[PDB]
């Protein structure tokens, strides 16, 4: 725990200063490369989290989503503001596309509001026909 | 028993030199012969750094808070002054050749600590800035800095072309001591890591602990401030002339 | 049980947006939040009997490492101790440092008033610079000495302290303040022993 | 009215003032030293025992 | 600089008082009488320093509110510039 | 840089009016605040040691020098008591005061 | 109501809520210690 201490305590800074004490090999804040970031946060939860579970295991992070395993530490993806509902279509489309749905067949066991007997043509002509304001009758 | 003492350095010439000035009393001179430096800490460790280091702090942030600025730097003195421990005849009063800035002792070395394990219990900033002083050597610095363009700001309230003009020069003074301000993203440039060629551990080479935060704002303030001086714009923008 | 599963929010809108590395972390911390829970039902018990620890992660867990602002916040108060600091909020004050402290507690302060409690801090640290060791004590279980110390007046006025470690663990033994002795040692009267 | 305009944002501008000043006020909660004043009354207290 | 004097009269009562063929006089809890008078004037030091702290807690709840009312005035002196300005164009229309 | 070597806002707009003696004050306050720091490389020492005695004019630099608003202030109290006196605060007042 | 009214405070550290444990557990301390002397059975009211 003071091994831990000592690279903090001998460092403090790299602007040299001339009267405190300072080492080399800083990194710009409020960037993926420095050590505060959400990327190291983010490196950190990872190597904690895929050693929670065995490796063959379905409840593993890199069986259940491989995604995560190839997620670019990069800080375009940390202030790029991407909207929700792409990454959840990306991840959903990435076990089985979006064509299986159209080829799909019938009589699905019992699913809420009957979506899945889907077609995405007619989906994509309807919302098209909505703000335009014609209906197909 | 083992060179432990329970004895105290002597009191009496302290009680000499509160008879005279507090300026020949927490000076480096009296803290050189009549304390030591391991008997700066040891059995009435606690009240010599309290006495020679945390009573200038409680004094001058108290003068800071109250705003009387001029006695607020004066208190500063004590502990950080830039080429200025002089003792009334010239002379830098230097150590070697080592013009003297910290009249504190134990800040006046670079020392190891060897005992503190596990801290991360003990969430005190306190506790760690005791294990090494470096953090209260930037402490000071930082507070020199605040006070410094506290004054400037408490020149520019007034809003006189004269008083503007005192104003600038404490603004020229930070810029001073902040030197001149370091480059960014110049040294080991971040490739683009994919996430599953990391390790758990640190020292890998790629995440590299910054450059301060406060001391990286101070820039910023006296770019904003200065920008506003070589215009007749205020703090908020707002035009002197019309 | 789908939104347990994948990780990733399967009702929300369109109208929310997120940086890639956030949701990669709120996915994770998800993941976390239930793995620590109980609520896993085939899990790996052998590295949870290491990071459940004494200092590891999922110990600060609850306390640190469930928000970033949180774990941000640990990672730079023991990488700068110095942005964090003030005069005021100390541990370890001695009672001297409160009779200062709240002594040059005015609003148009003169540097009088701090001289005049800098002279009434030396004139009290004067004292206990005098204090008489007379008596130890080295209790063995908890590693600590116990000093009892007499004053040099004629009136007794007895005081302690301690040293909170090894004597030879390092060259420091974490002191105390000399604190009075309260009850009935301190009438002037004469002592088989003590 | 185009002077008019710049007579309604002054009064839009003086109503966010007002309350980002309360927001400040009701976020910061007590101050430092009405904790200190309200500290000491219990450490009082506390050798009246 | 009143918890000194107690504890050394405290000190003082516990000596014999009464001499020749009749032993005593020392009063036996006087020790502990100054022990609670020296703990009441304690707790009454830190409720007059209490009743400072609250004192200057008020000081700085009103500067505040001088600041907000000062703040407001300066944003209402703003208003009513430009509302002069209305006026006085609403003058030049009516004098055209 | 050449801020410091000339004295001289190298960086000003043109809306900044200063009368000629208050320029010239500035330009040599920010030479005497940085021959006092330190900042100058060769400079001649046998006069500071002159200038930083009991009471002369560096040594008073930051309590009074520093500002033509506070030497004005000290030049005019050893000059006029008169007109910055008060029966209330006084040094050496009794008691019975 | 020694307890309720130590940790009265606005803005709590933990430093508070133990020393006013400390002070509960002391302050328990002494009663467990109470020597029971004399004891008297009220037939009427059923109460020792």
């Keep these: 725990a003071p091994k831990i201490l000592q690279p903090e305590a001998r460092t403090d800074l790299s602007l040299a200063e001339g009267i405190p004490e300072r080492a080399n090999e800083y990194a710009d804040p409020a960037s993926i490369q420095s050590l505060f970031s959400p990327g190291r946060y983010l490196c950190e939860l990872y190597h904690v989290a895929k050693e929670l579970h065995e490796d063959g295991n379905k409840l593993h992070i890199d069986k259940r989503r491989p995604d995560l395993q190839d997620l670019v530490l990069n800080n375009s993806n940390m202030n790029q503001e991407v909207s929700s509902l792409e990454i959840l279509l990306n991840v959903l489309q990435t076990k089985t596309p979006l064509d299986e749905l159209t080829k799909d067949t019938e009589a699905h066991a019992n699913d809420s509001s009957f979506t899945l007997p889907y077609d995405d043509n007619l989906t994509v002509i309807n919302a098209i026909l909505e703000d335009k304001a014609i209906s197909l009758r | ?242 | 049980q789908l939104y347990q599963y994948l990780l990733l929010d399967t009702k929300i809108g369109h109208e929310v947006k997120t940086s890639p590395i956030a949701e990669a972390i709120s996915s994770l911390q998800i993941y976390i939040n239930r793995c620590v829970d109980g609520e896993e039902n085939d899990l790996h018990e052998k590295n949870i009997s290491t990071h459940f620890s004494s200092d590891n992660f999922l110990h600060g867990w609850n306390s640190y490492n469930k928000r970033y602002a949180r774990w941000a916040g640990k990672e730079k108060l023991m990488y700068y101790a110095a942005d964090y600091i003030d005069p005021t909020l100390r541990y370890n004050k001695t009672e001297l440092f409160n009779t200062f402290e709240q002594s040059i507690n005015n609003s148009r302060l003169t540097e009088k008033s701090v001289k005049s409690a800098l002279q009434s801090y030396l004139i009290s640290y004067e004292k206990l610079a005098q204090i008489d060791t007379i008596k130890e004590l080295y209790v063995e279980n908890i590693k600590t000495h116990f000093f009892l110390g007499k004053t040099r007046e004629s009136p007794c006025q007895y005081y302690w302290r301690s040293g909170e470690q090894l004597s030879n663990d390092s060259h420091h033994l974490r002191w105390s303040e000399w604190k009075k002795v309260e009850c009935n040692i301190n009438g002037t009267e004469e002592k088989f022993f003590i | 009215l185009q002077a008019n305009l710049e007579a309604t944002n002054s009064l839009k501008s003086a109503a966010k003032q007002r309350s980002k000043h309360y927001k400040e006020l009701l976020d910061n909660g007590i101050s430092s030293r009405e904790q200190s004043g309200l500290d000491l009354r219990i450490d009082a207290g506390a050798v009246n025992i | 600089a009143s918890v000194a004097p107690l504890m050394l009269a405290a000190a003082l009562d516990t000596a014999p008082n009464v001499f020749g063929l009749a032993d005593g006089g020392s009063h036996w809890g006087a020790v502990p009488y100054a022990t609670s008078a020296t703990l009441q004037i304690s707790a009454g030091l830190t409720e007059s320093r209490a009743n400072i702290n609250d004192i200057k807690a008020n000081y700085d709840r009103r500067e505040q509110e001088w600041t907000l009312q000062k703040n407001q005035a300066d944003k209402d002196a703003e208003q009513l510039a430009h509302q002069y300005t209305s006026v006085q164009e609403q003058l030049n229309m009516a004098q055209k």
């Excluded at chain 2, 150590?95 to 009249?103: A, V």
């Excluded at chain 2, 005190?124 to 800035?129: C, E, H, K, N, Q």
């Design chain 2, 1 to 242: 028993d083992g060179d432990i003492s329970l004895l105290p350095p002597d009191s009496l010439p302290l009680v000499e030199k509160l008879q005279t000035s507090v300026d020949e009393l927490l000076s480096y001179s009296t803290q050189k012969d009549k304390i030591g430096l391991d008997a700066f800490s040891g059995s009435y460790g606690i009240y010599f750094w309290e006495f020679f280091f945390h009573i200038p702090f409680l004094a001058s942030m108290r003068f800071l808070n109250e705003q009387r600025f001029d006695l607020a730097q004066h208190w500063l003195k004590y502990l950080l002054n830039s080429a200025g421990y002089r003792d009334r005849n010239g002379n830098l009063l230097k150590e070697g050749d080592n013009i003297l800035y910290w009249n504190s002792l134990p800040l006046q070395q670079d020392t190891d600590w060897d005992k503190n394990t596990l801290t991360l219990p003990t969430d005190d900033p306190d506790v760690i800035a005791m294990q090494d002083p470096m953090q209260y050597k930037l402490a000071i610095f930082m507070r020199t800095l605040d006070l410094i363009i506290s004054q400037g700001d408490q020149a520019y309230r007034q809003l006189e072309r004269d008083t503007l003009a005192e104003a600038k020069i404490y603004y020229i003074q930070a810029s001073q001591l902040l030197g001149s301000r370091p480059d960014l993203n110049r040294g080991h440039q971040w490739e683009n890591i994919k996430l599953a060629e990391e390790s758990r551990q640190a020292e890998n080479g790629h995440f590299l602990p910054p450059y301060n935060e406060i001391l990286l704002s101070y820039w910023d303030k006296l770019e904003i401030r200065l920008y506003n001086l070589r215009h007749n714009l205020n703090l908020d923008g707002q035009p002197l002339h019309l």
